[PDB]
Structure 1
Amino acid sequence: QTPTGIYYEVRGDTIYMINVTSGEETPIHLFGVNWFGFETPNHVVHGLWKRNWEDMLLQIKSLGFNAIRLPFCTESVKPGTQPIGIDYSKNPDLRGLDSLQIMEKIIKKAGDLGIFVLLDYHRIGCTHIEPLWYTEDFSEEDFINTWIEVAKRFGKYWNVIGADLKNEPHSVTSPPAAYTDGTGATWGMGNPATDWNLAAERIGKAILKVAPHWLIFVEGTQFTNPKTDSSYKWGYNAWWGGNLMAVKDYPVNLPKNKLVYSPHVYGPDVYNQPYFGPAKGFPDNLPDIWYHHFGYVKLELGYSVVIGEFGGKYGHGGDPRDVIWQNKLVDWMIENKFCDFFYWSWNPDSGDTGGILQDDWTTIWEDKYNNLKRLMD
C-alpha cells in the first residue's frame, strides 16, 4: 500500500494525501513550477553555474510554490551519469555526485520544505522530446523498465507524488497522415502502438505495481483520431500534450482514484495560433477553447486535471498579447477552480517562454509572478 507512510489518491477532482497509520486525509493543492535540466545534456537542473541549488529551492518556497515538476531523461537517472556546468564554488556539497545523487538530494531538500515533487519522464534521449514513448533504439519495454527503476528508488521519498508518464505525446506530420503513419501519438485510433491512451494504461499499470501509493499523470496528445479532432473547430490546434478531447469516449483504463489528466496549454509566444487573433475573438474566445481541449475533463467528467505546463514571456521581449493570454488563463483557472498547476518554467533559459526568473538567474519578473500569484491567493 505504501513504503513511506503516505498514500496519494484522487477523490473526485481533488488530490489527497493519506497518512496510512493515522488514517488522516488532507486535500492538497499543487502551486507548482517546472525546474528543468535533468532531461538535457547538462544532466542536472539548470542554473547551478549562477546559483546554489538549495538557495534556489528556498527562493521557490519563498514565492509560495509547494510543488516542483522535475523533467528527466533516461541517462540522468542511470547511476554514473555526470552533470555538466555546475559552479562548485557555489555548490561544494555537489562535488563528487553524479546526476542521480543530485536528483535525490534535491527531492529530499524539497521534501524538508514541504514541497511535492512530480517526476516527468520528459525525453528518452537528452536532446529533444520524442513524439512517442519509444524510439528505433529504445523500446516500450525499455521505457517501462526505466520507470520501474525510477519508481523503486524514488517511491521511498514521502513528497514524490507520482509519475508523469511521458512528456508531450505529439505528432511530427500533419493529419490525416499523422493518424496512421506510425510516427506520432494518437488516441482512440485503435492501434495500441501509437494510441497513447492504451500505452498510458500499460505503463501506469507497471508503475502502480511497484509504487501503489503514487499518482499517474497522463497528458494529452496533439491529435487523437479524425472523428474526435474534426468534431470541434479548433480540434487540430491543441498543444503538444494538450489534446484531451478523446478522454470522453476513450478514457484511460486505470483506477480513477490514481489518475490525473495533465494537459499543457500555451500562448502566442509558443505558437501564433489563429485563435489568438482579435479578428477571431481573442481573448474572450479562450475559455471555450480551453474547455473543449481539456477543461471539460474536470468540469463535465469530474476527473482531477492538473495543468502540467503553461507559461510565456508575459511581454518581456515576446509577443505582448501574451500578457493578455496569461491574465485570461489565470482568471479562468480561478473561476473554474483549476487550482493545481506547474508553471513553465522556473528557469529563464526557455527560448519561447522565459520563466519566473530573469536571465540573471537571480531576480524574478515581478509582473509575471504577481499575475500567477493570484492562483496562490
Structure 2
Amino acid sequence: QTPTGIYYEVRGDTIYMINVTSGEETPIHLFGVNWFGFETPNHVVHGLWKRNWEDMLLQIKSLGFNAIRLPFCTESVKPGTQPIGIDYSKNPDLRGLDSLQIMEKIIKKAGDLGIFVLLDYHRIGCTHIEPLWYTEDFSEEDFINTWIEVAKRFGKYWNVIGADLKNEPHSVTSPPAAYTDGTGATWGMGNPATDWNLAAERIGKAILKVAPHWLIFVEGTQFTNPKTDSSYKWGYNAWWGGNLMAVKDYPVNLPRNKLVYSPHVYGPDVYNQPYFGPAKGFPDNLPDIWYHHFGYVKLELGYSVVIGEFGGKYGHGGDPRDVIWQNKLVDWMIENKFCDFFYWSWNPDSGDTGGILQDDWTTIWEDKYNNLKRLMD
C-alpha cells in the first residue's frame, strides 16, 4: 500500500523498489552522502551561503551518488522556523521560505534527479545528539508525534525511502552504571525506560501506520547489556549508534520486510579507539571488530545492513592513520557486499571528519573520493 505509487521493501538483505503502476520491481543500492544542517541552529542544509541548492544536488549526482541521508531536529520540521545562512542571491527561489518548505523543495527536486532520501531524526534540540529518544523536557510521545507528522507529510514524496528513527543512541556514563543508571540507551535489559530495541518497535510501528510504504532504519546503541558487551573483548568500544552485538539475542520486532539495521562506524579522526594502535594489529585487526559489532547481522543473520555514517579527514589536516582506516573499511565493505551506505559527510564543515567537498564548498578531495567510489563501481 502506498500514497506515492512507490513501495519499498527488504527481501533477504536487499532493498527493492516497487512501482505499483508500471508493475516494476527492482533491487536498489544506496550510494549515499549525508547533507547536514537542518539539525543545527541554521535550520537548513549548510553551504547555501556559497552554493545554489539545486547545483549541490546536481553535483552530488554527477559524482555517482543516488541517495542523501538528511538529518533534522524537531524545530526544523515545524512550520515557521526561520533558516539562517542562505545567499538568496544564489538561491532566489528560497526567499521567504521556512525550513520546512526548503526541505520539501530539496526533497522534491532530489526526486526529479532520481536521488533517494532517508529522513534522519538527528537531534531533539538543535545543538547536540541526546543519548535517549526523549529528555526531561521532551517525551517519547512527543518524539513519536513529531515522526508521525513528518511521515504524513513526506510520505507523499516518492523518493523518500523511510526513517532513520533516532541518530546515535548512546550513553553518557560508564558501565556498569550505564546499564541501569537510566542516563543512556541500552539493548536487551528488558527495561522500557532505556531499551532502544524496544523503543524502535514502538516508534517504528507508529510510522508504518502512516507510511506503510517506508523502510525503518534502526541504528545500534553504544552499550547494550552487560552480558552481551562483556562477551567480546571490544564490546565496550563500539561507536555511538554502532553497537549491534545485541541483535542476535534481541532482534527488533518490526516486519522483516521493512526493517533495516543501520550502524555507524568511524576512524581515528573521530576517536582514538584503543584498537587503532599498530601494536594492536591495526588495521588488519579491523575486519573482525567490524564483524563483531555489526557485520554479522548481515553476514550471519542475513539482515539488510546499511552503514548510516562513516568518514574522516583522509590525511588532510588529520591523523594520517585515517587514510589506511578508510581504505581498509571500503576494502571490507566491497568484499563482504555491504553495498548500501551513507558517507559523512557531503559537507566540508564537519569538525572531526571534513567531507567529500573541500573547504571552498566547490571542489572535492580527489583521493578521498577515489577511495569511496570503489563502492560505486
Tell me whether the two structures share a fold, i.e. TM-score over 0.5: yes
Q: Report 1:36-75 matches (<5 A).
A: 36-75=36-75
Q: Distance in 1 between matches of 2:360 and 2:48?
A: 12
Q: Distance in 2 between matches of 1:20 and 1:248?
A: 34
1:23: Cα distance to partner?
2.9
Report the count of equivalent residues: 377
Q: Distance in 2 between matches of 1:249 and 1:198?
A: 13
The one-character-per-residue Cα deviations of 1:166-186 (angstroms, maximum 9, x if unpaired) are 000000001000000111000
1:193: Cα distance to partner?
1.3
Q: Report 1:64-143 matches (<5 A).
A: 64-143=64-143
- What is aligned with 2:330? 330
Q: Distance in 1 between matches of 2:81 and 2:45?
A: 14
Unaligned ranges ≥5, structure 2: none
1:272: Cα distance to partner?
0.4
Residue 190 of structure 2 aligns to a residue whose secondary structure is coil
1:276: Cα distance to partner?
0.5
Q: Distance in 2 between matches of 1:327 and 1:51?
A: 30
1:155: Cα distance to partner?
0.2
Residue 16 of structure 1 aligns to a residue whose secondary structure is strand
TM-score of the aligned structures, taking structure 1 as reference length: 1.00
Q: Distance in 2 between matches of 1:362 and 1:176?
A: 47
1:51: Cα distance to partner?
0.7
The one-character-per-residue Cα deviations of 1:189-229 (angstroms, maximum 9, x if unpaired) are 11111000000000000000000000000000000000000
Residue 308 of structure 1 aligns to a residue whose secondary structure is coil
Q: Distance in 2 between matches of 1:24 and 1:354?
A: 39
1:22: Cα distance to partner?
3.4
Residue 304 of structure 1 aligns to a residue whose secondary structure is coil
The one-character-per-residue Cα deviations of 1:33-53 (angstroms, maximum 9, x if unpaired) are 000000000000000011111
The one-character-per-residue Cα deviations of 1:301-324 (angstroms, maximum 9, x if unpaired) are 000000000000000010000000
Q: Distance in 2 between matches of 1:180 and 1:193?
A: 10
The one-character-per-residue Cα deviations of 1:318-357 (angstroms, maximum 9, x if unpaired) are 0000000000000000000000000000001100000000
Q: Distance in 1 between matches of 2:105 and 2:286?
A: 40
Q: Distance in 2 between matches of 1:329 and 1:21?
A: 39
Q: Distance in 1 between matches of 2:71 and 2:262?
A: 14
Q: Distance in 1 between matches of 2:130 and 2:161?
A: 24
Q: Distance in 2 between matches of 1:279 and 1:251?
A: 35
Q: Distance in 2 between matches of 1:315 and 1:241?
A: 25
Q: Distance in 1 between matches of 2:141 and 2:121?
A: 14
Residue 246 of structure 1 aligns to a residue whose secondary structure is coil
Q: Distance in 2 between matches of 1:53 and 1:181?
A: 44
Residue 376 of structure 2 aligns to a residue whose secondary structure is coil
Q: Distance in 2 between matches of 1:105 and 1:191?
A: 41
The one-character-per-residue Cα deviations of 1:225-256 (angstroms, maximum 9, x if unpaired) are 00000000000000000000000000001101
Unaligned ranges ≥5, structure 1: none
1:85: Cα distance to partner?
1.0
Provide the aligned C-alpha RMSD in A. Answer: 0.5
Residue 117 of structure 2 aligns to a residue whose secondary structure is strand
Q: Distance in 2 between matches of 1:181 and 1:356?
A: 39
The one-character-per-residue Cα deviations of 1:64-116 (angstroms, maximum 9, x if unpaired) are 00000000000000000000011111111100100000000000110011000
1:21: Cα distance to partner?
2.9
1:19: Cα distance to partner?
1.1
1:25: Cα distance to partner?
1.0
The alignment status of 1:239 with 2:239, answered yes or no, reads yes
Q: Distance in 2 between matches of 1:318 and 1:263?
A: 24
Residue 375 of structure 1 aligns to a residue whose secondary structure is helix
1:137: Cα distance to partner?
0.8
Q: Distance in 1 between matches of 2:233 and 2:22?
A: 50
Q: Distance in 2 between matches of 1:31 and 1:128?
A: 26
Q: Distance in 2 between matches of 1:30 and 1:107?
A: 16
1:24: Cα distance to partner?
2.1
Residue 260 of structure 1 aligns to a residue whose secondary structure is strand
Residue 305 of structure 1 aligns to a residue whose secondary structure is coil
